[PDB]
Amino acid sequence: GSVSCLANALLNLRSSTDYNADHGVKNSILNFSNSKDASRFDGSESWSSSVLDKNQFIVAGSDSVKHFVAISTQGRGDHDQWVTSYKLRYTLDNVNWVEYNNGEIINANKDRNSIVTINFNPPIKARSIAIHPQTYNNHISLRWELYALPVKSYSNPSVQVGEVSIGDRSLNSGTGSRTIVRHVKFPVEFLSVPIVSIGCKKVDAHTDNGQMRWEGKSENITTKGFDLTFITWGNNAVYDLTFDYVAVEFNN
Amino acid sequence: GSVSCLANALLNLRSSTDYNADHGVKNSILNFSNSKDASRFDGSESWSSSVLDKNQFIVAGSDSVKHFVAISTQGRGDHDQWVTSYKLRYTLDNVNWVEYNNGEIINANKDRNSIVTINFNPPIKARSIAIHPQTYNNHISLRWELYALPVKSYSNPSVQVGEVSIGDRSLNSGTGSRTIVRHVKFPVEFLSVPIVSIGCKKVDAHTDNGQMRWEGKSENITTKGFDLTFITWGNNAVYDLTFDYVAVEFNN
Amino acid sequence: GSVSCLANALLNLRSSTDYNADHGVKNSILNFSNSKDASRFDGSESWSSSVLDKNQFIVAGSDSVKHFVAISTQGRGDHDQWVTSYKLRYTLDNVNWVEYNNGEIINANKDRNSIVTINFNPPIKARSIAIHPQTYNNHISLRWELYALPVKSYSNPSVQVGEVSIGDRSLNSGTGSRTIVRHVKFPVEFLSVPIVSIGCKKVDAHTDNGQMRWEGKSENITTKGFDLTFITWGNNAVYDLTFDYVAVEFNN
Ligand SMILES: CO[C@@H]1O[C@H](CO)[C@H](O)[C@H](O)[C@H]1O
Ligand SMILES: CO[C@@H]1O[C@H](CO)[C@H](O)[C@H](O)[C@H]1O
Numbered sequence: 083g084s085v086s087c088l089a090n091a092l093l094n095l096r097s098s099t100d101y102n103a104d105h106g107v108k109n110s111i112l113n114f115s116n117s118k119d120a121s122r123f124d125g126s127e128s129w130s131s132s133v134l135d136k137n138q139f140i141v142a143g144s145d146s147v148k149h150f151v152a153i154s155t156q157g158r159g160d161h162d163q164w165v166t167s168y169k170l171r172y173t174l175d176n177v178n179w180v181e182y183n184n185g186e187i188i189n190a191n192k193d194r195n196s197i198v199t200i201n202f203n204p205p206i207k208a209r210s211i212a213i214h215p216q217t218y219n220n221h222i223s224l225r226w227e228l229y230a231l232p233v234k235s236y237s238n239p240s241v242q243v244g245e246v247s248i249g250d251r252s253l254n255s256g257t258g259s260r261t262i263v264r265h266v267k268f269p270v271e272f273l274s275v276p277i278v279s280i281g282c283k284k285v286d287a288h289t290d291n292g293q294m295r296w297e298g299k300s301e302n303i304t305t306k307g308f309d310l311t312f313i314t315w316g317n318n319a320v321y322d323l324t325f326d327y328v329a330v331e332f333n334n
Numbered sequence: 335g336s337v338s339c340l341a342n343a344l345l346n347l348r349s350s351t352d353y354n355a356d357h358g359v360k361n362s363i364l365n366f367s368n369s370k371d372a373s374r375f376d377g378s379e380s381w382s383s384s385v386l387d388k389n390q391f392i393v394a395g396s397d398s399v400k401h402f403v404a405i406s407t408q409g410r411g412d413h414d415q416w417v418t419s420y421k422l423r424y425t426l427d428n429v430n431w432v433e434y435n436n437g438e439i440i441n442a443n444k445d446r447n448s449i450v451t452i453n454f455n456p457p458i459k460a461r462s463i464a465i466h467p468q469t470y471n472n473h474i475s476l477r478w479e480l481y482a483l484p485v486k487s488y489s490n491p492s493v494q495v496g497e498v499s500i501g502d503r504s505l506n507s508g509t510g511s512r513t514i515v516r517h518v519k520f521p522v523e524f525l526s527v528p529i530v531s532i533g534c535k536k537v538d539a540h541t542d543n544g545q546m547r548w549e550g551k552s553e554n555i556t557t558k559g560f561d562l563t564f565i566t567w568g569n570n571a572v573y574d575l576t577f578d579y580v581a582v583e584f585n586n
Numbered sequence: 587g588s589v590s591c592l593a594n595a596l597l598n599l600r601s602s603t604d605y606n607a608d609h610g611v612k613n614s615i616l617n618f619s620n621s622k623d624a625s626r627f628d629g630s631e632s633w634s635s636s637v638l639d640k641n642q643f644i645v646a647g648s649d650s651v652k653h654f655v656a657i658s659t660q661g662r663g664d665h666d667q668w669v670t671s672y673k674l675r676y677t678l679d680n681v682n683w684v685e686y687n688n689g690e691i692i693n694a695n696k697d698r699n700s701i702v703t704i705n706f707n708p709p710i711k712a713r714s715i716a717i718h719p720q721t722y723n724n725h726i727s728l729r730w731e732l733y734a735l736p737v738k739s740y741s742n743p744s745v746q747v748g749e750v751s752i753g754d755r756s757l758n759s760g761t762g763s764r765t766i767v768r769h770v771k772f773p774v775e776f777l778s779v780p781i782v783s784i785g786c787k788k789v790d791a792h793t794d795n796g797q798m799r800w801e802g803k804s805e806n807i808t809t810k811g812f813d814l815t816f817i818t819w820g821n822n823a824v825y826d827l828t829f830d831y832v833a834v835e836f837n838n
């Protein structure tokens with residue numbers, strides 16, 4: 083499953099013109115249908131432009147970088163109007179706009195209800211995308227859907243950073259496996275339990291017959307903090323060790 | 335304070351049907367009220383559906399993962415219509431939708447103006463959420479607000495990475511505290527001053543009577559770069575040291 | 587170029603009141619114009635309020651932190667109405683709202699079509715921003731655009747983390763440049779090739795006549811994983827080494 087962006091209300095829509103508000107982009111979702119009552123008008127089953135020319139469009143946008151894998155278009159559900167061809171333009175940085183496939187005119191609908199779907203390989207990578215109807219039956223009227231790849235579990239992570247040292251002579255003597263634990267509080271509590279990555283930025287340690295032995299481990303990670311377990315073994319004397327840590331929260 | 339999402343214009347809204355555009359979701363914010371003039375209609379003080387059945391809804395969405403802590407609903411301000419019960423559905427990945435509390439029918443409004451608030455513990459974690467009115471007085475008409483936790487200071491950070499080495503024999507001789515500074519330019523200038531985290535990925539150093547002594551510090555961090563101060567002391571000779579750095583910008 | 591936020595459909599808009607849906611915020615973009623046909627009304631070339639008082643507004647919002655560098659306003663294109671002064675309020679956390687320049691009344695339009703632009707130095711840093719018309723000619727009617735800095739290449743990166751060790755005695759003997767490669771699969775495949783940053787969190791190694799020599803390198807990075815090349819040289823015997831890695835994907 084890809085994501086149906088309009089169905090999920092993921093994108094802002096902006097048309098060039100509307101026939102009136104009862105023909106607005108709010109009425110443009112694929113398969114949109116309203117009351118079948120012939121005595122009261124509740125709006126077109128489509129966006130319909132006001133101006134009929136080759137310069138009309140709907141822009142769809144949001145802040146996220148989307149990978150668009152398809153677009154589907156359909157005509158108007160309640161009257162004989164539909165877009166028969168269009169062009170597509172898009173932008174990643176919202177400053178520089180590009181023409182899809184050098185301004186290819188894409189062949190579109192030929193009736194009220196049949197769905198015509200264009201697939202993108204590779205995906206169009208964009209923050210905003212615009213459909214530009216070029217030809218039409220009766221009126222520039224359409225329904226549509228944009229399909230994007232779902233967001234990855236690893237996207238938009240939250241991050242907190244710090245440093246942690248032994249800070250005393252706890253590991254500076256003795257024999258065999260020896261550890262000390264420093265408890266670290268994150269500056270702010272996370273909403274779920276992060277992972278904690280660590281890297282050494284100071285070693286002050288004595289070899290044991292030429293062998294250096296030191297290790298750091300992040301352990302007992304909660305939303306509030308974690309334990310840096312400093313570890314030596316054999317007969318090494320560790321005077322101090324310092325780690326920077328990067329705590330990363332996913333999915334929140 | 336939680337965030338009033340509609341008040342702050344944080345979510346796109348999409349209804350199943352509207353009575354017409356003058357009854358659209360744009361009119362649905364909690365406590366919405368317009369001109370009290372009886373001679374001109376400026377729109378309902380509510381969203382109102384067009385179709386009256388058990389299949390109508392408003393979807394609210396955006397790209398961010400929200401933690402919804404409450405929903406409030408209210409009836410229509412200018413006419414005797416209000417939703418008396420509803421269901422809620424939501425989605426995190428915008429592909430898979432779930433029914434809140436196994437499709438619990440929530441008891442809602444009984445007049446025009448009184449606010450009925452449902453609290454979520456734990457918070458509903460979602461990109462999009464849909465209210466599905468089930469029963470109503472007169473018409474499916476509502477006002478509403480969604481309340482989410484505020485965004486954390488640590489969310490959506492910007493990141494730049496690199497590596498930095500001594501690259502010569504500056505630290506390879508001498509006695510006592512000795513340092514050298516390498517200035518590092520970020521590939522692109524940040525908008526505010528980042529933190530810089532560092533971890534060692536190369537040691538080429540001589541012990542001093544068995545003691546190893548090396549340290550790296552990021553210092554003098556600006557929007558443009560920072561100084562990696564490489565440090566040794568006692569009588570160690572450091573031939574080379576290499577750090578990877580992770581520069582993180584928050585709040586921008 | 588800064589970003590034209592409304593042109594690019596980047597922000598949700600919410601007005602206090604609309605004269606009706608045919609005067610809604612959907613009609614408010616700078617230079618908006620529709621059919622010049624005098625016989626059919628397709629909507630005002632502006633947002634127009636319904637209530638005329640000092641309490642009307644449009645809020646523009648989305649989840650991203652924007653750096654607003656300018657606002658432009660214009661009157662109504664199709665009738666003699668325009669906003670002659672306004673105030674601005676904004677919010678970063680969507681809980682706490684601030685008044686721009688202590689509630690400065692900004693002098694605005696004096697006709698239908700001329701654009702009046704206010705520049706912000708420093709940029710207003712905000713998730714949502716509201717224009718509050720204070721005085722007007724004929725009606726509270728406006729067109730507008732908000733201009734923000736473009737998003738940086740380094741924003742909203744995706745991140746994956748892990749750890750990698752030699753895990754055997756491959757580097758524990760021998761002379762001269764010696765390496766072993768551990769291949770690392772990311773828990774999930776990236777959409778483009780990430781950078782991989784590394785930091786050491788365990789050293790178990792023997793000096794060679796007092797010299798310590800160890801290095802780690804991330805190499806052959808693909809969307810699926812990378813190689814950690816563990817390196818020693820001279821005559822050092824490395825028993826084990828462990829790195830945490832941070833893989834960062836940009837622009838996706
Ligand atoms: C204590 O005996 C072993 O010595 C080895 C070096 O020869 C490594 O340091 C091992 O980790 C250690 O357990
Ligand atoms: C120079 O005397 C001290 O020696 C110690 C080892 O015994 C540590 O290395 C200290 O950092 C150092 O200051």
Ligand SMILES: CO[C@@H]1O[C@H](CO)[C@H](O)[C@H](O)[C@H]1O
Nearest residue numbers: 538539573797798799819820
């Ligand atoms: C092998 O001879 C050299 O020895 C030096 C120490 O004196 C450093 O370790 C160099 O990297 C190494 O190449």
Ligand SMILES: [Ca+2]
Nearest residue numbers: 116117118124
């Ligand atoms: Ca109908």
Ligand SMILES: [Ca+2]
Nearest residue numbers: 368369370376
């Ligand atoms: Ca009214």
Ligand SMILES: [Ca+2]
Nearest residue numbers: 620621622628
């Ligand atoms: Ca007109």
Ligand SMILES: [Cl-]
Nearest residue numbers: 285537546789
């Ligand atoms: Cl070391």
